């Protein structure tokens, strides 16, 4: 039958890619609610095109402006505002799936509301597993919600795993389904061939080839992905390897016990992984062409050097320590990057800030509230370490 | 519980790879019968190690020599000889799976006997589908036998396909499980970068060199002409029920990727691994589970660069013939396969040039299908007729 969707985070690239898949499959997917942060203009255009039952701005002042516009552009769309309203559209009885694409800590509560209601969760918020991995997996178990990862690397891993593990994410023992290890691939960022010595002098201009760009450059992006993969797939440290693949044609791979490797490849378009999150276990047209082997060029592989990418080592370390450490590390890194971009600290100080803060905190029963509180503490400590370094 | 095996073709590399996997999993697999053609020395050593209930030599004279060697060294091994005995061990009530690794046309009857008995078939004979695809698929359907492909390409495709297709091979509509197409992958052979003009003069030595897998002379030459990929195309049609829109061919020179499947959402699944036949075998034995195969995980720090090319039909005319033969049906694929056996043997005998292989294949195929209810017997007969014609065309070329 028709699958009914709420899209949390409708005005960014993920939202757009989701809508493109839905546009290719009007017989299968129906948009009940669209929700966003504060890009009212884009949201007006989308409510006009999609005429959803509900439209929600996270910001109440932004909601008011949208309401005025939709009196005219989408008169049958009920406009709402605030966090409560995000939870309300994420938990509607008629809704089957929730694209959880509101980014940052503000995404936690609405995503979790969808989990507690037993929805299918198309997970495109990093914070849910980076900050609150154990909570999320427990609440998913308790409600019977289905979790499907949107992000490219996770989605590729998901596709490369057997059906038995796919249907029971975060609870299968991987060794028992024949998995030796997961190969999380990444481009290595723009400093992949740069001599370690030259990293000290790197500028924000160079690092950007904004926040997510700097994370690419440090491989903190991959670290956070590693942490998420641990929770999504219940992988131990022996089961999770990071491989640099500079061309990003392969999006990730799984090594099996018999020697077999499965890899997922394709054109660089988020509609591909999204489309599977919506259609699983079936497949649908995504508006993405088949891979052109005439243009992929050479594929190569490198082992990450932890001297080049110290943030990657920290994230791996933090992962073994648990939720408190991953929350701490994620928070500290937001502050550290903001400081680098503000010119206050060198590129290589990002890891130093992260490393001090992490060491300070972990030298000493969780909720989303207590973890947000730790996130704030960690930020305060990072502000102080940033000061020591200027 | 314990899976019971008959191995047809125990003394070659496939047999050895199968026995390596079994040796890693004594709690899961047990060998009921071993069968071979005339390598008594190797069979004696294997019967001594495995002490199977039955040992069969295809050649009755060889069976007699084995029987004498085994009286004491393997006293509980009943030794048998001939074709009837191959069918008997392939159809035993206690046997669950049959590694069908007897190569050539001689493999047809025993492999078919296992099919008709409803066994799990670990298919490692090309001829079953190249010569008699339609027959095999129909008999598999009737008996409830399971076909699991051993060959590297097919096994990779199998792994890149969804569980629903995997459990119902040759019966599923591929479009309906989201498949756009299968990408059949080949190395391109040692002449992949060679100018077409220089192909005329190439030698057997050149044709056999720098291989990514261990292969005998014939299969190596087929790799050089891309006849290998053509035959595999024909098999893939029967095995996956793939239409003319669903089967493509691509060159991947390093043979790290073994095959790939393109899906409707843009997603491509690829199977990769060390060039060790224990990997695909192991899955044919363990499916839907997995087992240790004695093969190391792939080391991505040593695979080097992966690249892709497109086959040029001027460099690979056999590939065009195979595709054409596939559209024409069983008679044409049987004819082509037979003609190519003769043509390659002639090239290796230094009677014809490398580029005469396609010319011989092309004449023979044209002659037969210009001039117009199948059985294994009638298809063997066509194979012999096509061989006679190929012998004649080889003579014209020397």
UniProtKB/Swiss-Prot annotation, chain B:
Q: Which GO terms describe its molecular function?
A: 1-deoxy-D-xylulose-5-phosphate reductoisomerase activity; manganese ion binding; NADPH binding
Query: Reaction catalysed by this chain?
Result: 2-C-methyl-D-erythritol 4-phosphate + NADP(+) = 1-deoxy-D-xylulose 5-phosphate + NADPH + H(+)
Output the Gene3D superfamilies linked to this UniProt entry.
1.10.1740.10, NAD(P)-binding Rossmann-like Domain (3.40.50.720)
Co-factor requirement = Mg(2+); Mn(2+)
At which positions is NADPH bound? 11-14, 39, 125, 127, 216
Task: Name a biological process GO annotation.
Answer: isopentenyl diphosphate biosynthetic process, methylerythritol 4-phosphate pathway involved in terpenoid biosynthetic process
- What residue range is the signal peptide? none
Q: Which residues take part in binding Mn(2+)?
A: 151, 153, 232
UniProt keyword list: Isoprene biosynthesis, Manganese, Metal-binding, NADP, Oxidoreductase
InterPro entries per UniProt = DXP_reductoisomerase, DXP_reductoisomerase_C, DXP_reductoisomerase_N, DXPR_C, DXPR_C_sf, NAD(P)-bd_dom_sf
**What Enzyme Commission number(s) does the record list for this chain?**
1.1.1.267
Pathway(s) of this molecule? Isoprenoid biosynthesis; isopentenyl diphosphate biosynthesis via DXP pathway; isopentenyl diphosphate from 1-deoxy-D-xylulose 5-phosphate: step 1/6
Binding residue positions for 1-deoxy-D-xylulose 5-phosphate: 126, 152-153, 187, 210, 223, 228-229, 232
Class of the enzyme per the UniProt entry, highest EC level: oxidoreductase
The family line of this record is: Belongs to the DXR family.
**Role this protein plays:** Catalyzes the NADPH-dependent rearrangement and reduction of 1-deoxy-D-xylulose-5-phosphate (DXP) to 2-C-methyl-D-erythritol 4-phosphate (MEP).
Q: What is this protein called?
A: 1-deoxy-D-xylulose 5-phosphate reductoisomerase
The protein's organism comes out as Vibrio vulnificus (strain CMCP6)
